[PDB]
From a paper:
Central to the replication cycle of influenza viruses is the viral RNA-dependent RNA polymerase which transcribes and replicates the viral RNA genome. The influenza virus RNA-dependent RNA polymerase is a heterotrimeric multifunctional machine composed of polymerase basic 1 (PB1), polymerase basic 2 (PB2) and polymerase acidic (PA) subunits, that catalyzes both primer-independent replication (vRNA to complementary RNA (cRNA) and cRNA to vRNA synthesis) and primer-dependent transcription (vRNA to mRNA synthesis) in the nucleus of infected cells. PB1 houses the polymerase active site, whereas PB2 and PA contain, respectively, cap-binding and endonuclease domains required for transcription initiation by cap-snatching. High-resolution structures of the complete viral polymerase from a number of human, avian and bat influenza A viruses, as well as influenza B, C, and D viruses have been determined. These structures have revealed that the polymerase is a highly flexible macromolecule that can assume a variety of distinct conformations, enabling the polymerase to perform both transcription and replication that require different initiation and termination mechanisms.
A panel of 24 nanobodies (Nb8189-Nb8212) was generated against recombinantly expressed and purified polymerase of an H5N1 influenza A virus. Using cryo-EM we determined the structure of 17 polymerase-nanobody complexes at resolutions between 4.5 and 6.7 Å; this is sufficient resolution to accurately position each nanobody bound to the polymerase heterotrimer. The nanobody binding sites were spread across the surface of the polymerase with related nanobodies binding at the same site. On the PA linker (site 2), that links the N-terminal PA endonuclease domain and the PA C-terminal domain and wraps around PB1, we observe three nanobodies; Nb8202 and Nb8210 bind identically at residues 220–240 and Nb8204 binds at residues 250–265. Based on data from the in vitro and minireplicon assays, we selected a subset of inhibitory nanobodies that bind at different sites and carried out viral growth assays in cells expressing the selected nanobody prior to infection with a reassortant influenza A/WSN/33 virus encoding polymerase and NP of the 1918 pandemic influenza virus. Nb8210, used as a negative control, had only a minor or no effect on viral growth.
Numbering used by the authors:
A (entry chain F): 1 to 23, 32 to 51, 60 to 99, 112 to 122
B (entry chain A): 1 to 716
C (entry chain B): 1 to 185, 207 to 756
D (entry chain C): 1 to 249
Write the structure that this text describes.
RNA sequence: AGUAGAAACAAGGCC
RNA sequence: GGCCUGCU
């Protein structure tokens, strides 16, 4: 019943910014190539706190993740999730 | 089943049983057999009590109908059929009057012959069990118990049956009527056992209707119902949410501490403008005294005669003329008022006995001087709306005025000694304890120090003037009244003396609110020429009324002698607070005694005598161009007394605000001087808070100048 | 040489002579006219400190309400009412964790009290806003009027005599289509649902007088009678909670406050080692009441009452629900003057919604323009925050939660803090190994305070090293120092009556000697001055003097008649035997052995027509509003003499349309006196029950006539006469 | 006789009849406190303002039939104009002093028995013995102490039933006091005050004061005894201690 | 005019 | 001119 599509990923510079968007409580999770899932934010983890901000528009039915001051260690597929329902993920490469 | 109690029983009993039903708060629709059972109990109580009378003998007189007479005494008087409070009232009253024992449960009747209670109960079950049941319910009971049961049997302890047997035949006929009438009804499927002693209830406080919707509109922004918010609260647990918002909150939200150093505090800025004027209700530094040297005490005597006698002691009267005009009023009115006062004083002098209080004529002169018929007439808004000039009352910050040097000199001479004792204290219980002797000696020392002080004279002047003004306002509300300013002192030689500063004319004083203003006009003799400090007398009109000759080595001066005349006003609150000026003595001398006690806690001995005689120790109590000047403890006493007196005289909201906001800065400066690393979050805000209290009051501006001087001398 | 008292501080420390800085010997500032301007200013200020919230319109009252909760976090140090629900819930959770069992217990005792409380407890209160007349009236009068209106409308559950039932009726009244009220000018007027809702949710605004310590006047509020029961229950819960918190100082007296302050400072400094520095902040909170949102109090109470009976939660939640929708009456109005035509006018505040703005100055014009959108039926919606410290105890609870949130277990850093909070004032002792640690600790404390809608007044606050600070006019300098300038206004005649004034004055001198370190000689001087003022106020001079007054003749003849003149009371023109050793003895008992038996009997005669006693509460209790504090009551020792008269009443009701209230007063008092003669314990213990007057009175007449015959004066003739007279009044009550 | 007679007279008039009928016992207190008189905010100001009027105090109507309307010179003692919301009449303060020089006299021998606390204070102080004053810093520490020196080890409610049974024996209701200390107190204060006619309310109030224990927090240095706390103002100071021994010891 | 200071008094109402 | 009120 809950389909999810992520937008806003891509190739960025280190120290740059990026606004992920995903069209119930909700979460942003990430998966690096060599690992399983990592908690990012819900509506933040130690590795992303202060850099990253999660925010939702319940009228637009969308959850956003505003990433700033990015590091090469953010490089992952960022998946959106609803709580059982998981997006396909959007690639972010820093 | 309730149809039976609809049909048979009389109204009286059914509503008695209904109120007994309401008594313990259970509802009649759920279980009614209790209603029927207890109403039958109540019916047997009546039918057993009524129709039974007594006369002066025992041997109750039984009459089917009470005949008209004083002989209507009832054999058995009922307990039940009443509320619990009254049932226990009757129980206690019977016990206290009959000298009997108090039962712990409710009886049903009282009887005289045997002087005791009856607890009637007719139960469905047979008697010979219910009897001893209720008997073991009641502890060690002398009240006789008697019960019937439907089969028709009777029983009792002592084999005692207290009245006629035809009455009991009546009871059991009633009983079987009940029985074989339910026979037609058919209730025994539950009649024998229908009550088991149920007592339980749940308190219900339900939010519903409009009040529920209000609850749905008093939640955080993203909640829809009180149910959901309460569920969220119950499910809420701490998961480090304060830390997240603290990290996300902007860092400009801080409480950075600004160090407070010697170079940090700046002098308080004083307002600039026209010089400050005089606000007191009487002359303080420029007063003159006409005396008689009478032996009367402060309150002893009659005012008008004393004033006239004092004024006759002076010779050299001249026709009064204007010297310094009011600059805003009609000085000829003041001149005519002075001459009118003199004329009416003579008029009193002529007649038989000086009146205790005199009323003056309401001439146009004092009508203007006292502000009569000047309040705008009160009307309705619907009748005055097109008037362009119609607007609010003038509500703005007071006029700004700069400090002048006259208040400083006035305070300087308010702390100086005098040639008289201006305090005659009352009596106290003879001292019995050594501590009381120490207290009395200390008090005598302070009285010797402060009695010869201009501050005490001002205290007495204000107290007397305000007392007389308040009493006249409360008594002679309508008519203008004359009151001579009188103060009685004692000379160094010991001879008592009276002093007449001048006169006060009180006007209409229909004072309703504590802020309503009573206007009066004050006239006071003086020798100080007003041509040297005119800005201090902005609101005064000063005439020339005579010449005075005081013995001096330079021939004899033959100085002029002027009359300061002005229109002033007060209020009930101001009069009341000015008539309690004697607590300035308290304030000051409590401070000095605290100093003495604090110093004496160091050296294990009372230190008052050496403080007051040796005068070795001194405190900074003023600054001279050479530097800071220190004075003995007595001078500190007088200085603090003068400060308190001026606080009571020039009281105003400015004084309170400045006092608070400057005590804050004084504490900060003291912390700095104590090496306690003081710090401030916004010192500019505190400075702006202090500086907004300084507008036009001479006293607060002088206090601010003193504070600036203290800062300059401190911080070193 | 120029005299300057302030220079005295160069030798005497500031706190050792702080009494000199308290000008409490002059008249305190008073307000003169309307308080409407202050009310409008307060409403606008409360609404603009929360401007960034969200607006809504209540569907019941139709008034605009502003909700700032969970709003944007502040980005400046200005006052802000944007409290965060999660943060405050977490603070309350930590408060519970540090004090396990606090909420459950406090709720248990509160539940006991609520389910055993009576209606009459609401009469024990000062002025309350009666909505039946739209004006402030004594609590008992307003309660009686509301009960009468409810009974006339059909809400008679309050007849159960329970406050909970009265509140049930109050809530049920909210769902009525049309209520009826009475007005005299009697006219019966009908109030629809919305009008009655607004009349029950409104507050009456007045100007506070006799307020020392500030240049500007303020406004205060008084609620109605429908909401006072819920407030009573909520404050009972909050008091029970705070009594279990040592960091709170609101439910205690002054000496307890000083003791707790000393204990906390010693604990903080002593435990601190040589390496840790300690600093005390003497903090005041700016706009304390205007920034406390009732919704947050609702959240706190619903967290407190978790796992409790739902009815208890509902009854405790009703109060903040009504405060969140509270309305405020603008005030008396505005008075205009026209000098050209020489007249004055008084427009009521209710016209501010429609009256043109040509009559108002720029400041008032702008205030009215800003407050008009919130005007609904002559009253302004004040949802964003509290008006004047109605929830003092809950605010203290929030402050104590903030204080406890830095117990070094939640700080997670070397620095830590503690202190004492009493609403609008606090002392904060913060310790940290270095000045940087102290700065970080104070910064985090301030930031956390801003997350709870609490602001710290930077202008009225300062930080120094521990050992010197201030708290509610109590100056601590290595130990509290007496002031004696706060109690100076209480050294005069109280104004109750002669005996009461004498006893109160001597007792005040005694107490200020015990507590405020008043000196012996100073106390003797105070006694002398008080006796002088007392004699000059009551026209009771020594008698041997020639001071002619309205009372000097009778006093002088009594003086010449008495043989042992040393036993005469000062009220009757006798000598004063009081001294430092006799300050704890009533005057009558101190002079008992010296009085002549004739004068003694005439003085203390029960049949005197002057002594009047109403209830056990008002026997020897005097309400003296202390300077710089809330109204307080004192027990004064006095003997019931002929001097214990009660003074004249106002008597201005005779010129008002509300003149029938005096006839009702007289009739009620006649009935009450009759009942008391029938029920002597009516005064000491208030009677309880559900019966009516005449039933109890007639039935007790029956029984008392009976028994007083069985031994006493009555006779058969009289007993039968009483019995048939009881029957006569019975049949009269029938018809 | 009389009581039921004014009852019938009240019920004669319709308004008072309605008040008596519809008003329940529980509401007794409310209507008794029902008044238009506001509680004074500034009592001192008006006491200093009212005493300057003629007829500033209030007294029962009976004063009109015990005290003459005027004294020897014609100064009026009482007026027939009733108070605002009461049947009492406004009278002058002289009517007080007059009552103390020619008013009816009684036997005040039992007032010492009633006002037990105050007379016990006087007796304790009269036989006290003072001592030298020692000047040294006093470390005043704040402690909770009992001020009432005659408390019989009873609380407010605990002694309230005792007080009712002593004064109002019939309105006690269910309660019959179990503790034997209360029994002896009731017996003593019953036989002692058997015919005292001061007032039931004042007797009850003073019994409550005497028997009920009361406690307050005060700055003390030494002492700590009930008898030594009533004179705490005289024995302890800022820098001086006055040795004292009340008459009881 | 005067008192006083963010609004008032300098009598009110009723005939 | 006569009378009423002074916290309503």
């Amino acid at each position: 019943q809950v389909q999810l599509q992520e937008s806003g990923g891509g190739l960025v510079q280190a120290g740059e910014s990026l606004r992920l968007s995903c069209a119930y409580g909700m979460g942003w999770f990430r998966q690096a190539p060599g690992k399983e899932r990592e908690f990012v934010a819900s509506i933040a983890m130690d590795f992303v706190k202060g850099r990253f901000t999660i925010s939702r528009d319940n009228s637009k039915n969308t959850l956003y993740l505003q990433l700033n001051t990015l590091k090469p260690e953010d490089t992952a597929v960022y998946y959106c999730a609803a709580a059982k329902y998981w997006g396909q993920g959007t690639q972010v490469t820093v | 089943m309730e149809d039976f109690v609809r049909q048979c029983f009389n109204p009286m009993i059914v509503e008695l049983a209904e109120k007994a039903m309401k008594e313990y708060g259970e509802d009649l629709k759920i279980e009614t057999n209790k209603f029927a059972a207890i109403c039958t109990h109540l019916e047997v109580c009546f039918m057993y009590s009524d129709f039974h009378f007594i006369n002066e003998r025992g041997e109750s007189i039984i009459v089917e109908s009470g005949d008209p007479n004083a002989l209507l005494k009832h054999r058995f008087e009922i307990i039940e059929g009443r509320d619990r409070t009254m049932a226990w009232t009757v129980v206690n009253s019977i016990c206290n009057t009959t000298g009997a024992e108090k039962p712990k449960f409710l009886p049903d009747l009282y009887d005289y012959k045997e002087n005791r209670f009856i607890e009637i109960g007719v139960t469905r079950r047979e008697v010979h069990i219910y009897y001893l049941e209720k008997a073991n319910k009641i502890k060690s009971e002398k009240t006789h118990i008697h019960i019937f049961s439907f089969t028709g049997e009777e029983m009792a302890t002592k084999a005692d049956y207290t009245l006629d047997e035809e009455s009991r035949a009546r009871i059991k006929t009633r009983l079987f009527t009940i029985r074989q009438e339910m026979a037609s009804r058919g209730l025994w499927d539950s009649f024998r056992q229908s009550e088991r002693g149920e007592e339980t209830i749940e308190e219900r406080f339900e939010i519903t209707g409009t009040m529920r919707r209000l609850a749905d509109q008093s939640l955080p922004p993203n909640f829809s119902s009180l149910e959901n918010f309460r569920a969220y609260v119950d499910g809420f647990e701490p998961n480090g949410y304060i830390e997240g918002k603290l990290s996300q909150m902007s860092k400009e939200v801080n409480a950075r501490i600004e160090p407070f150093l010697k170079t940090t505090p700046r002098p308080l800025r004083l307002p600039d403008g026209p010089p400050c004027s005089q606000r007191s209700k009487f002359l303080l530094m420029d007063a003159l005294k006409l005396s008689i040297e009478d032996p009367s005490h402060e309150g002893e005597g009659i005012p008008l005669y004393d004033a006239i006698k004092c004024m006759r002691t002076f010779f050299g009267w001249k026709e009064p003329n204007v010297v310094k005009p009011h600059e805003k009023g009609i000085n000829p009115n003041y001149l005519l008022a002075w001459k009118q006062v003199l004329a009416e004083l003579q008029d009193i002098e002529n007649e038989e006995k000086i009146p205790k209080t005199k009323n003056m004529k309401k001439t146009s002169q004092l009508k203007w001087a006292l502000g009569e018929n000047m309040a705008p007439e009160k009307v309705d808004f619907d009748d005055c709306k097109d008037v362009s000039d119609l607007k609010q009352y003038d509500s703005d910050e007071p006029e700004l005025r700069s400090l002048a040097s006259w208040i400083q000199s006035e305070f300087n001479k308010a702390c100086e000694l005098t040639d008289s004792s201006w305090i005659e204290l009352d009596e106290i219980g003879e001292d019995v304890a050594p501590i009381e002797h120490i207290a009395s000696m200390r008090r005598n020392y302070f009285t010797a120090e402060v009695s010869h002080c201009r501050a005490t004279e001002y205290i007495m002047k204000g107290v007397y003037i305000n007392t007389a003004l308040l009493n006249a306002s409360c008594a002679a509300m309508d008519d203008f009244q004359l009151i001579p300013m009188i103060s009685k002192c004692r000379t160094k030689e010991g001879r008592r003396k009276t002093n007449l500063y001048g006169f006060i004319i009180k006007g209409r004083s229909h004072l309703r609110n504590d802020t309503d203003v009573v206007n009066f006009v004050s006239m006071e003799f003086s020798l100080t020429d007003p041509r040297l400090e005119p800005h201090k007398w902005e609101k005064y009109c000063v005439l020339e009324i005579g010449d005075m000759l005081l013995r001096s080595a330079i021939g004899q001066v033959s100085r002029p002698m002027f009359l300061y005349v002005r229109t002033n006003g007060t209020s009930k609150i101001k009069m009341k607070w000015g008539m309690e000026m004697r607590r300035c003595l308290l304030q000051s001398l409590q401070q000095i005694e605290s100093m003495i006690e604090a110093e004496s806690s160091v050296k294990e001995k009372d230190m008052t005598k050496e403080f007051f005689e040796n005068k070795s120790e001194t405190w900074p109590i003023g600054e001279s161009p050479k530097g800071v000047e220190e004075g003995s403890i007595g001078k500190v006493c007088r200085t603090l007394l003068a400060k308190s007196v001026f606080n009571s005289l020039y009281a105003s909201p400015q004084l309170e605000g400045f006092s608070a906001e400057s005590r804050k800065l004084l504490l900060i400066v003291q912390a700095l001087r104590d090496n306690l690393e003081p710090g401030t979050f916004d010192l500019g805000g505190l400075y702006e808070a202090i500086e907004e209290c300084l507008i036009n009051d001479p006293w607060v501006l002088l206090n601010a100048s003193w504070f600036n001087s203290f800062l300059t001398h401190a911080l070193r | 040489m120029d005299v300057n008292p302030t220079l005295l501080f160069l030798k005497v420390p500031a706190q050792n002579a702080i009494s000199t800085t308290f000008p409490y010997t002059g008249d305190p500032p008073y307000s003169h006219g309307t308080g409407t301007g202050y009310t409008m200013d307060t409403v606008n200020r409360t609404h603009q400190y929360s401007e960034k919230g969200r607006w809504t319109t209540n569907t019941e009252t139709g008034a605009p309400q502003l909700n700032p909760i969970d709003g944007p976090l502040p980005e400046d140090n200005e006052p802000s009412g944007y409290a965060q629900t999660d943060c405050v819930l977490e603070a309350m959770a930590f408060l519970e964790e540090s004090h396990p069992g606090i909420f459950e217990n406090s709720c248990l005792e509160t539940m006991e009290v609520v389910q055993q409380t009576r209606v009459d407890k609401l009469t024990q209160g000062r002025q309350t806003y009666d909505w039946t007349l739209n004006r402030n009236q004594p609590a008992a009068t307003a309660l009686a009027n509301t009960i009468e209106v409810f009974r006339s409308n059909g809400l008679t559950a309050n007849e159960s005599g329970r406050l909970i039932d009265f509140l049930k009726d109050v809530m049920e009244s909210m769902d009525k289509e049309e209520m009826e009220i009475t007005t005299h000018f009697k006219k019966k007027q009908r109030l629809n649902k919305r009008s009655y809702l607004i009349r029950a949710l409104t507050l009456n605004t007045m100007t506070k007088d006799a307020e020392r310590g500030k240049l500007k006047r303020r406004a205060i509020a008084t609620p109605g009678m429908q909401i006072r029961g819920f407030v009573y229950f909520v404050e009972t819960l909050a008091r029970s909670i705070c009594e279990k918190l040592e960091q709170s100082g609101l439910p205690v007296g002054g000496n307890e406050k000083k003791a707790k302050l000393a204990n906390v400072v010693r604990k903080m400094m002593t435990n601190s080692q040589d390496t840790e520095l300690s600093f005390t902040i003497t903090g005041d909170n700016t706009k304390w009441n205007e920034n406390q949102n009732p919704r947050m109090f609702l959240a706190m109470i619903t967290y407190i009452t978790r796992n409790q009976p739902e009815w208890f939660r509902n009854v405790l939640s009703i109060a903040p629900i009504m405060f969140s929708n509270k309305m405020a009456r603008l005030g008396k109005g505005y008075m205009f003057e026209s000098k050209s035509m020489k007249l004055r006018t008084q427009i009521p505040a209710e016209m501010l919604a429609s009256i043109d703005l040509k009559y108002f100055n720029d400041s008032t014009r702008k205030k009215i323009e800003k407050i008009r959108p919130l005007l609904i039926d002559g009253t302004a919606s004040l949802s964003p925050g509290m008006m004047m410290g109605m929830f003092n105890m809950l605010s203290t609870v929030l402050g104590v939660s903030i204080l406890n949130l830095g117990q070094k277990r939640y700080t997670k850093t070397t620095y830590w803090w503690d202190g004492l909070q009493s609403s609008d004032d606090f002392a904060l002792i913060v310790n940290a190994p270095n000045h940087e640690g102290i700065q970080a600790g104070v910064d985090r404390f301030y930031r956390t305070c801003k997350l709870l809608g609490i602001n710290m007044s930077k202008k009225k606050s300062y930080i120094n090293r521990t050992g010197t600070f201030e708290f509610t006019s109590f100056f601590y300098r290595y130990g509290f120092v007496a002031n004696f300038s706060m109690e100076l206004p209480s050294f005069g005649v109280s104004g109750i009556n002669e005996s009461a004034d004498m006893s109160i004055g001597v007792t005040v001198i005694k107490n200020n000697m015990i507590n405020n370190d008043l000196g012996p000689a100073t106390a003797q001087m105070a006694l002398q001055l008080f006796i002088k003022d007392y004699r000059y106020t009551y026209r009771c001079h020594r008698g041997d003097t020639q001071i002619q007054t309205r009372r000097s003749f009778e006093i002088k003849k009594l003086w010449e008649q008495t043989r042992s003149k040393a036993g005469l009371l000062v009220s009757d023109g006798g000598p004063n035997l009081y001294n430092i050793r006799n300050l704890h003895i009533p005057e009558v008992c101190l002079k008992w052995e010296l009085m002549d038996e004739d004068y003694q009997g005439r003085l203390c005669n029960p049949l005197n027509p002057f002594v009047s006693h109403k209830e056990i509460e008002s026997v020897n209790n005097a309400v003296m509003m202390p300077a710089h504090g809330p109204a307080k009551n004192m027990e004064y020792d006095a003997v019931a003499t002929t001097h214990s008269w009660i003074p004249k009443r106002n008597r201005s009701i005779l010129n008002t349309s509300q003149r029938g209230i005096l006839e009702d007063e007289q009739m009620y008092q006649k009935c009450c006196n009759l009942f008391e003669k029938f029920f002597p314990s009516s005064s000491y213990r208030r009677p309880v029950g559900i019966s009516s007057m005449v039933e109890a009175m007639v039935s007790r007449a029956r029984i008392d006539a009976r028994i007083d015959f069985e031994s006493g004066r009555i006779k058969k003739e009289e007993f039968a006469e009483i019995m048939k007279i009881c029957s006569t009044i019975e049949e009269l009550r029938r018809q | 006789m009389e009581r039921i007679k004014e009852l019938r007279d009240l019920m004669s008039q319709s308004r008072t009849r309605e008040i008596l009928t519809k008003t329940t016992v529980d509401h007794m207190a409310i209507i008794k406190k029902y008044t238009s008189g506001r509680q004074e905010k500034n009592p001192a100001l008006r006491m200093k303002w009212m005493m300057a009027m003629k007829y500033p105090i209030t007294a029962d109507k009976r004063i009109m039939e015990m005290i003459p309307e005027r004294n020897e010179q014609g100064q009026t003692l009482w007026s027939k104009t009733n108070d605002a919301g009461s049947d009492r009449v406004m009278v002058s303060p002289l009517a007080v002093t007059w009552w103390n020089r020619n008013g009816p006299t009684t036997s005040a021998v039992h007032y010492p028995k009633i006002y037990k606390t105050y007379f016990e204070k006087v007796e304790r102080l009269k036989h006290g013995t003072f001592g030298p004053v020692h000047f040294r810093n006093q470390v005043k520490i704040r402690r909770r102490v009992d001020i009432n020196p005659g408390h019989a080890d009873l609380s407010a409610k605990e002694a309230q039933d005792v007080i009712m049974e002593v004064v109002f024996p019939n309105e006690v209701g269910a309660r019959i006091l179990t503790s034997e200390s209360q029994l002896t107190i009731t017996k003593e204060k019953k036989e002692e005050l058997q015919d005292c006619k001061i007032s039931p309310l004042m007797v009850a109030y003073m019994l409550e004061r005497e028997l009920v224990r009361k406690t307050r927090f005060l700055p003390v240095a030494g002492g700590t005894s009930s008898v030594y706390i009533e004179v705490l103002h005289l024995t302890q100071g800022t820098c001086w201690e006055q040795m004292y021994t009340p008459g009881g010891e």
